[PDB]
Design a protein around this ligand. Structure first.
Ligand SMILES: [Ca+2]
Ligand SMILES: [Ca+2]
Ligand SMILES: [Ca+2]
Ligand SMILES: [Ca+2]
Ligand SMILES: [Zn+2]
Length: 316
């Protein structure tokens, strides 16, 4: 809508207070005009019809419990936009400041979130397995990263290329979590998963096998579930990325860590410059080595650590 930019205040899913960019025109709308062509948050009103109604509020205060998922979807979309702009010089997901749209309150008791090809969508969860999914910044950044991947490499959502697609979203979801820097970790979804059980998460990058996911190529899933295991075999790549950053010895192979910032730079370059829709794990390794070479030289520690990380997980 057309109106006056302003700043409102609200409470997110976890009860934390934050400021949000809104637009005023009779009502106050969740429309942030300060980032590219805008960030827009919609109410799907417990239906599956999308996008729903652009979120309108009478007083620019968002403290009602119904408000919380919208506050967080709106605010964390902004953080993610800032991460891509400030760190990788990328303007929104298409690189040309496309408007970012999110809908919340999708369906009833819906235990997931997703990018549908044009916007992000967030369920409220059933209160048992999940609380509203926009409450996790790693979850928001994961979904928005699918949009980035679709506009760049275009990795098909099947088999190895699909597992790479998933790992990239987990990797950048985590890097964005570290960017915002409130209790960052190498786990996925811990803020919104199983409110009744502390210390768990949906996936682990530091130790995928904790939840039964493979951490070595020899343990890859070869069946047909989950589109050929796109959320399962991602653990192999997530472990590689964790090792490149933090270091460690894994199946007897030692890796010198080079830290998060270099991990992000290498993987972003691989994504945007070298990966293609049908890239497999071996092609990821080659793309990552070539990226690190481009940035730091063929005889760098950086190139060395990428090679050892991929050897450690069994990807040749
Ligand atoms: Ca209000
Ligand atoms: Ca965390
Ligand atoms: Ca996390
Ligand atoms: Ca939990
Ligand atoms: Zn995903």
């Amino acid at each position: 809508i057309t109106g006056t930019s302003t700043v409102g205040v609200g409470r997110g899913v976890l009860g934390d207070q934050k400021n949000i960019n809104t637009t005023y025109s009779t009502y106050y709308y969740l429309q942030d005009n300060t980032r590219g062509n805008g960030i827009f948050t919609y109410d799907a009103k417990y239906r599956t019809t999308l996008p729903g109604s652009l979120w309108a509020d009478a007083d620019n205060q968002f403290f009602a419990s119904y408000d919380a998922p919208a506050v967080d979807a709106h605010y964390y979309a902004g953080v993610t936009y800032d991460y891509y702009k400030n760190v990788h010089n990328r303007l929104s997901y298409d690189g040309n400041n496309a408007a970012i749209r999110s809908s919340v309150h999708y369906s009833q008791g819906y235990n997931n979130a997703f990018w549908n090809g044009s916007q992000m969508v967030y369920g409220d969860g059933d209160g048992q397995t999940f609380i509203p999914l926009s409450g996790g910044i790693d979850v928001v950044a994961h979904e928005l990263t699918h949009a980035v991947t679709d506009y760049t490499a275009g990795l098909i959502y099947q088999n190895e290329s699909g597992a790479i697609n998933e790992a990239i979203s987990d990797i950048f979801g985590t890097l964005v979590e570290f960017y915002a820097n409130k209790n960052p970790d190498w786990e996925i979804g811990e803020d919104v998963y199983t409110p009744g059980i502390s210390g768990d998460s949906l996936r682990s990058m530091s130790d995928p096998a904790k939840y039964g996911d493979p951490d070595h190529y020899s343990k890859r899933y070869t069946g047909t579930q989950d589109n050929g295991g796109v959320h399962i075999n991602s653990g192999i790549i997530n472990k590689a990325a964790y090792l490149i950053s933090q270091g460690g010895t894994h199946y007897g192979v030692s890796v010198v860590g080079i830290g998060r910032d270099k991990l992000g730079k290498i993987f972003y370059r691989a994504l945007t410059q070298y990966l293609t829709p049908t890239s497999n794990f071996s092609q990821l390794r080659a793309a990552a080595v070539q990226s690190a070479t481009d940035l730091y030289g063929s005889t760098s520690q950086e190139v060395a650590s990428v090679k050892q990380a991929f050897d450690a997980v069994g990807v040749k």
